[PDB]
C-alpha cells in the first residue's frame, strides 16, 4: 500500500541512523589530541590577476599547477599563467552567465556553462590557433552549476534540475544520467580515483555516485541549508561540504556520517567554495565575509584568515601540486595565495 | 627575459582586447525582465522588436540588453545574484489573475541585491481588465477593495497595492499601464533608464 511503504520508508530511515550511530563509538575531535596543530598559516598574496572586470565566478587549476581558467560575468573565459601573470588565452563565451569552468586533466580542453542550460566545451589545441567550441552539451533543463572532466572524452555535470549527468564528448549524447536529488544540485567534486563523485544540492544532502552506473551509494545530511561547496578529501575516502550554514563539515565515505563541523560564533556568512590542501591537513573555505578562512581539518580550529578581496570569495582552489591556493572573487581580482 | 617576451606581448594584446570588450559592452544597458508567468512579456519585447533569453533592442542611440530570466524553472534565490548590478527590472504583471504576482513583487523589490535598483512596473493587457471589471467586480480578487468597479480607481488601487510592497524609499517604482499599445512601452522604458543612468552618473561624481 502507498501508506505502508511510506511508513516503512521512515522505518528504513531510523534504523540506518541507528546503525550509523552504532559505529559512532568515537569522534575525531578527541582523537586529534595526540597531534600538534599547524599554528598561524600566514599566507600572503604572491600575485594578483587583475584581468577581469566583473565578478570572476569560478576558477580551476590545471594539472600543470601552472595555469588557471576563470569565468566571469564579463563573458570572457580567460586562462591565466600563475607566474608570468600572462593571459595566454581569452575565449569569448556564447553566454556571459557562467558559474562553471573546468580545466581538463590533460590540459587540452576547457569547459564552461551556466544559466544557458548548455555545457560548452572548448578545444585549446586547435590547429587553427584559436580556442573554439568543441561540442555544446545540450540536454539539461536547469542551469548548470559545476563541471568536471573525468578524461578528455567524458565530462560529469551538475545542474539545477536536480539531476547530475555524465556525457561522452565523442558524440554529445547524455550517455548516463543520474537522479535522486530534490533541490538544485550546486557543487560537484570528482574523486581522485575518478570512479566516484559526490555532489551537494539545495536540500542539504550530499551523496556519492558511482560513475559506472546511475546508482547513488550513500547519502549525507549533516547540514541544515543548501550545499554550496563540496570537495573530496585528497586521499579519496572522505569529503567536506560548505553551505549557507556558515560552517563546513567533513564526511567519511565509509563511516557514512559527519565527522567535524567547522563553525564559530563570529562567522555568519555562508560558504561559497571549498577545497583541501595536498596532505588534507589543511582545509580552505571561502566565506561571504569577503575573506577566506583556513581551517585545520583535524583540530577543527581556525588556522587563520586570508583576506584581500573587496567582495565575495566566490571560488577557491588549491593546485594539484599543492604549490599555492588561488581565490577568485566578485571583486574580479583573482588572488594567488601561498 | 627569453623569447617569452613574445608571450608577454601576446598577453599585453589580450589585456588590451579585454579592455576594449569591457568598454564596448558597458555602452549597452542591462534590463532584467522578471515577471509572472504568461504576463505578456513576449508581447512587450515583440512590440519593442531555454535559459536566459537575452533578447535585445536598441532605442535612440541606447542599446538595451533585455534578459528574460523566466525561461528556466528554478528557485530565484539560486540565480538572482547573477543579475546584481542590472540597471533596472522590467517587471510586468497581467491583470487577468494574481496574488502570486504580488508575492513575486514583494520578493523582488525588498531583495538584498536589488535594494538600489529601479523597477519599471508594467500593467499589461488593461483592455481585458476593463472587460472583466465590466463583467465582474474586483472584490472577487481583492476582498478589501471598498471602491466601485469603475476603471480608474480600481487600476489606481492595484497599482498602489503593488507599489506598497517597497521597503526602501531610496528605490522607485515607475508603474505604467500599457493596454497593449505600441511604442509607448519602449518610451517609458527609455525614460526610466535615462533617469537611472543620470542618477548613477551623479553618484559617480560625488553629487550624491
Amino acid at each position, epitope marked *: 500500500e502507498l501508506d505502508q511503504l511510506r511508513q516503512e520508508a521512515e522505518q528504513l530511515k531510523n534504523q540506518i541512523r541507528d546503525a550509523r550511530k552504532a559505529c559512532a563509538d568515537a569522534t575525531l575531535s578527541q582523537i586529534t589530541n595526540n597531534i600538534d596543530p599547524v599554528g598561524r598559516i600566514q599566507m600572503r598574496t604572491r600575485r594578483t590577476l587583475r584581468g577581469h572586470l566583473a565578478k570572476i565566478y569560478a576558477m580551476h587549476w590545471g594539472t600543470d599547477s601552472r*595555469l588557471l581558467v576563470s569565468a566571469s560575468q564579463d563573458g570572457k573565459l580567460i586562462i591565466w599563467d600563475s607566474y608570468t601573470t600572462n593571459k595566454v588565452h581569452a575565449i569569448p563565451l556564447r553566454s556571459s552567465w557562467v558559474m562553471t569552468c573546468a580545466y581538463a586533466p590533460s590540459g587540452n580542453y576547457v569547459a564552461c556553462g551556466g544559466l544557458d542550460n548548455i555545457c560548452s566545451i572548448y578545444n585549446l589545441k586547435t590547429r587553427e*590557433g*584559436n580556442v573554439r567550441v568543441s561540442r555544446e552539451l545540450a540536454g539539461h533543463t536547469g542551469y548548470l552549476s559545476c563541471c568536471r572532466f573525468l578524461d578528455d572524452n567524458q565530462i560529469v555535470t551538475s545542474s539545477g534540475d536536480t539531476t547530475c549527468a555524465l556525457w561522452d564528448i565523442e558524440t554529445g549524447q547524455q550517455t548516463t544520467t543520474f537522479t535522486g536529488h530534490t533541490g538544485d544540485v550546486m557543487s560537484l567534486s570528482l574523486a581522485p580515483d575518478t570512479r566516484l563523485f559526490v555532489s551537494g544540492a539545495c536540500d542539504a544532502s550530499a551523496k556519492l555516485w558511482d560513475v559506472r552506473e546511475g546508482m547513488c551509494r550513500q547519502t549525507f545530511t549533516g547540514h541544515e541549508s543548501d550545499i554550496n561547496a563540496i570537495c573530496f578529501f585528497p586521499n579519496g575516502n572522505a569529503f567536506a561540504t560548505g553551505s549557507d550554514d556558515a560552517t563546513c563539515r567533513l564526511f567519511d565515505l565509509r563511516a557514512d556520517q559527519e565527522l567535524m563541523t567547522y563553525s564559530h560564533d563570529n562567522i555568519i556568512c555562508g560558504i561559497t567554495s571549498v577545497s583541501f590542501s595536498k596532505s588534507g591537513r589543511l582545509l580552505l573555505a571561502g566565506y561571504d565575509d569577503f575573506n577566506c578562512n583556513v581551517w585545520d581539518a583535524l583540530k577543527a580550529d581556525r588556522a587563520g584568515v586570508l583576506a584581500g578581496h573587496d567582495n565575495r570569495v566566490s571560488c577557491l582552489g588549491v593546485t594539484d601540486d599543492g604549490m599555492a591556493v588561488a581565490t577568485g572573487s566578485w571583486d574580479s581580482f583573482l588572488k594567488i595565495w601561498n | 627575459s*627569453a623569447e617569452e617576451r613574445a*608571450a608577454l606581448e*601576446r598577453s599585453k594584446a589580450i589585456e588590451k582586447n579585454l579592455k576594449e570588450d569591457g568598454i564596448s559592452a558597458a555602452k549597452d544597458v542591462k534590463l532584467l525582465l522578471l515577471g509572472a508567468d504568461n504576463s505578456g512579456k513576449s508581447t512587450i519585447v515583440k512590440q519593442m522588436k531555454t535559459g536566459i533569453v537575452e533578447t535585445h533592442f536598441t532605442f535612440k542611440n541606447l542599446h538595451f540588453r533585455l534578459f528574460d530570466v523566466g525561461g528556466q524553472r528554478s528557485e530565484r534565490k539560486k540565480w538572482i545574484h547573477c543579475f546584481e548590478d542590472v540597471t533596472a527590472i522590467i517587471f510586468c504583471v497581467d491583470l487577468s489573475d494574481m496574488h502570486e504576482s504580488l508575492m513575486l513583487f514583494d520578493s523582488i523589490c525588498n531583495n538584498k541585491f536589488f535594494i538600489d535598483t529601479s523597477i519599471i512596473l508594467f500593467l499589461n493587457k488593461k483592455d481585458l481588465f476593463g472587460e472583466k471589471i465590466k463583467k465582474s467586480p474586483l472584490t472577487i480578487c481583492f476582498p478589501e477593495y471598498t471602491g466601485p468597479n469603475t476603471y480608474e480607481d480600481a487600476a489606481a488601487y492595484i497599482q498602489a497595492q503593488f507599489e506598497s510592497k517597497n521597503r526602501s524609499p531610496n528605490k522607485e517604482i515607475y508603474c505604467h499601464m500599457t493596454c497593449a499599445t505600441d511604442t509607448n512601452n519602449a518610451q517609458v522604458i527609455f525614460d526610466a533608464v535615462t533617469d537611472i543612468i543620470i542618477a548613477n552618473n551623479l553618484r559617480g561624481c560625488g553629487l550624491y
Partner: single-chain antibody
Amino acid sequence: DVQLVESGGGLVQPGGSRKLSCSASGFAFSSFGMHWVRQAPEKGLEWVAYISSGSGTIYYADTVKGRFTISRDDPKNTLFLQMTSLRSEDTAMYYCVRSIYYYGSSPFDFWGQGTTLTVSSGSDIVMTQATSSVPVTPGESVSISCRSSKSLLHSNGNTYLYWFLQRPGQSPQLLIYRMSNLASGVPDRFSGSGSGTAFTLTISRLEAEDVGVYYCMQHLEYTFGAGTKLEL
C-alpha cells in the same frame, strides 16, 4: 587544412628589389607571428625576418637589416617581405613559417612550400653540427647531435633548441620543440634530449620516411646550424 602559399619568385637583376609574399589560409593569421626563413640552393637554412603578432615588434638578420623589410596584412592574411638592393648571396628559396608563443605553445609548427629566388652573377649565438652525413638503414637506430656557443637553458627552466626535418624535395616540418617535446603529427620514433650546451636527437626505430636533413636551431635570442643528411 593549413596552407602557406608563397609567391613572387623569379629572376632579379643584381641591385634590384622584389616583394616576397606569403598567403595564408585555414587559420587565424592575426594570432600568429611570422618568419621568412630562407635556404640557399647549396647550404642550410638561414633566418631572415620575424614579425610579431599584431606587428608589435620586428627583427631582422644582420645580413638584411635595413636592406629588407617585413609587413603583415592581417585583413588579407598575407605576409610580405620587401627585399631591396639584392645581392648574389640572396639567391635562395624562401619559407614562410608560423609561430604562436605562449606557455605550452610550439613555435614553427607549419612551413610553407616556399618559392625559389635567383639573381644573376656579377655577441651572437651559433649552432654547429658534429656531422654532415650519416648512413642509415630501415629498422636501425640513429643519433644526431648539435652544439652551441653558450648554454640555451634560460633562468625559467626552458631550453630553446629546436629540431627540423627536411625530406628531399619537400619543405621542412617541426619535430622537437624546446628539445624534449614532440610536435603534432611527429611519430614517437623521434625523441630529443640533452643538457647544458650539447644536445642530441634520436630517431630510434627508423622508418623509411625519416630520410632527409635534420636542422637544429637555437631560439634564446634573435639560428639554424648546417644540418646533416641521413642516407638510407
